[PDB]
């Protein structure tokens, strides 16, 4: 496995701009050495949970691909970024599979994503006809039809525009503050491994 380039974890974690959770961002990481040590002992991360593998063993592991999904939600919703969860985020925005293999990291981004008066650029989907399949993404803006009456593309009675804005303000309480979230998915196929820890 001839690999000498380091995986671009800093490009993901240290980006200036994060996507709204309904249009969540995905970067494919392959063909590189993954130095997870820059993630260890962070004074920033309020959530570091892994699934299927132990964090302590990440430098000894090889994967066919790694996927870096990133987005912003509110603090109270970080718990939904996990297998088996339910809620507006898990049902309508970002869904992890029951057999998820990977890690979920999150940190408070009040200093970057709040604005006195309200930062209305971060949206989430509130209504949807059915729940998302794992790793599905829905960016439609079709008016949600809540009654027997067709909506004909216009908001109204029983006819709601499906996205809603977080409107983050720095004075919000912690549960309503913006959190930046990175989901690393460790994909293993019947193919040679392209992402490996420094110890492999």
């Amino acid at each position: 496995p001839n690999i000498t380039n380091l995986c671009p974890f800093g490009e993901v974690f240290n980006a200036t701009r994060f996507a709204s959770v309904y249009a969540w961002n995905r970067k494919r990481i392959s063909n590189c050495v993954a130095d997870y040590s820059v993630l260890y002992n962070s004074a920033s991360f309020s959530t570091f949970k892994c699934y299927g593998v132990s964090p302590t063993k990440l430098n000894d592991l090889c994967f066919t691909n790694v996927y870096a999904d990133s987005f912003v939600i509110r603090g109270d919703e970080v718990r939904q970024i996990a297998p088996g969860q339910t809620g507006n985020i898990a049902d309508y925005n970002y869904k992890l599979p029951d057999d998820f293999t990977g890690c979920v990291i999150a940190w408070n981004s009040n200093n970057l994503d709040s604005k006195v008066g309200g930062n209305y650029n971060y949206l989430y989907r509130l209504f949807r006809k059915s729940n998302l399949k794992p790793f599905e993404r829905d960016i439609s803006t079709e008016i949600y039809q809540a009654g027997s009456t067709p909506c004909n593309g216009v908001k109204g009675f029983n006819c709601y525009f499906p996205l809603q804005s977080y409107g983050f303000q720095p004075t919000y309480g912690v549960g309503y503050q913006p959190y930046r979230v990175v989901v690393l998915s460790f994909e293993l196929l019947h193919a040679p491994a392209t992402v490996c820890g420094p110890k492999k």
């Epitope: 997870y36 040590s37 260890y40 002992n41 570091f48 949970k49 892994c50 699934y51 299927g52 593998v53 132990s54 964090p55 302590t56 063993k57 430098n59 996990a82 297998p83 088996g84 029951d98 057999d99």
Partner: antibody, heavy 120, light 109 residues
């Protein structure tokens, strides 16, 4: 024969601090993750802290900011510094070796426990 | 995290009896489940990992089965030295490993 031996438990006043030690023998200490797990009659077995082989430390929210795990591989030793102790921290504290078979992780070796009593 | 529940709470059985205790995870965890035995004054002892692999040195009368959310520990023939509390533990979510509340196995004589 793998052995783990805890030391340092005892009486400590609320708000005080205390260090627990665990001395390991019978294996290559540097090659394994080490853990602290506490036990109380009311809440059973509870994970307290973990240190890997890359300097990485992990704590539950109930413990972050108050406890610090560390290791001295040159002396095959594990430590848990504890600050701002509350009555609810009274427990038996075990050190435990972690290992894995494939992706499956387990605690294959435990110390004898050391009793921490937090009381004025 | 993931909550673990055990059944029964306690059990009285005779020597030679088949003992069966069950563990349930609050969500699907595949085979990421271990079983531990704890005798009075002693630390837990690993019996089973990966839901069904017998740890080295553990007697063969101990066995684990199950996948997903429900798991079972079985003692084929209860011996007196098996009096203890048995705990299950999910190894799916780290670092926040969580333990079941335990099942006490008393010996009837």
């Amino acid at each position: 024969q793998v052995q783990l031996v805890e030391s340092g438990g005892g009486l400590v006043q609320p708000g005080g601090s205390l260090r627990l030690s665990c001395a390991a023998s019978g294996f290559t200490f540097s090659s394994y993750d080490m853990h602290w797990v506490r036990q109380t009659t009311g809440k059973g077995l509870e994970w307290v802290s973990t240190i890997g082989t890359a300097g990485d430390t992990y704590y539950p929210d109930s413990v972050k900011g108050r406890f610090t795990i560390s290791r001295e591989d040159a002396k095959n030793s594990l430590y848990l510094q504890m600050n701002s102790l509350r009555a609810g921290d009274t427990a038996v504290y075990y050190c435990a070796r972690g290992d894995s078979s494939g992706y499956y992780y387990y605690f294959d070796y435990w110390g004898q426990g050391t009793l921490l009593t937090v009381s004025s | 995290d993931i909550q673990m529940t055990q059944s029964p709470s306690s059990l009285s059985a005779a020597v030679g009896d088949r003992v069966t205790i069950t563990c349930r995870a609050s969500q699907s965890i595949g085979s990421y489940l271990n079983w531990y035995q704890q005798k009075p004054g002693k630390a837990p002892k690993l019996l089973i990992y990966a839901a069904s692999s017998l740890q080295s040195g553990v007697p063969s009368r101990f066995s684990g089965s199950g996948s997903g959310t429900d798991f079972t520990l079985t003692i084929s023939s209860l011996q007196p030295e098996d009096f203890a509390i048995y705990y299950c533990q999910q190894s799916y979510v780290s670092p926040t490993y969580t333990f079941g509340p335990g099942t006490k196995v008393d010996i009837k004589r």
